Amino acid sequence: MPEETQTQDQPMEEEEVETFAFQAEIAQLMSLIINTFYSNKEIFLRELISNSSDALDKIRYESLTDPSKLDSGKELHINLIPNKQDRTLTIVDTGIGMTKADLINNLGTIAKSGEKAFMEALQAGADISMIGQFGVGFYSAYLVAEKVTVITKHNDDEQYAWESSAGGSFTVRTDTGEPMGRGTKVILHLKEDQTEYLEERRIKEIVKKHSQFIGYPITLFVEKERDKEVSDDEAEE
16 A cells, blocks of 8 residues: 555665667677577477476575475465467466576676687587586577566565567566566567467477476466456556
8 A cells, every 4th residue: 555644764766777789799699599490399398497496496495494484385386377369478486586686697698718618619519408517507588489578576675577589689677567476477478470389289288298397286377358358557466
């Protein structure tokens, strides 16, 4: 309840809204990822879901200091909400998420010549699968999407809305209007030409095979539109 009846002493805060265009060196690497077509959509779940479970394991481990913080768990679950018209598959975890300082700090890659650089290594006989132990875990979700948007908030830190569409140009903006309790809201903007990742029949089958590694509750939601006509950003808790 917004009480204008004299709140408290507090800073006006600054809007962390930074927009950046492709960096020449990173544009080389990232565009080559676009050049390198991916004919296997299975790796998508395998490595991305790995991060989802990891984000939960980290929060699960951190809570060993105080089990009372978890009450009895409840935070160990993966919720999937697919938007049929919006073509937006929303996967939200209740894990640790990411922090404000860490987001902008870990945001980058190795462009410096530290013995092994993917550019030179490419001609020296490297491989895409070298990333695992050579640098970077999850850059983003642009391997086969229109745009990748992650709204995360550590329950103590602020919420941010990170989005990137194949790297061309991205923007990092804090506070998305919609409140966040904790976790990571990973919403894939799928193109209409990417119906391969949205057909009800396909969703069940593809997510069935790769959900084996998921030991946490798998909840595929079927959220139907009640209001019928909606054109605002108003959510309902």
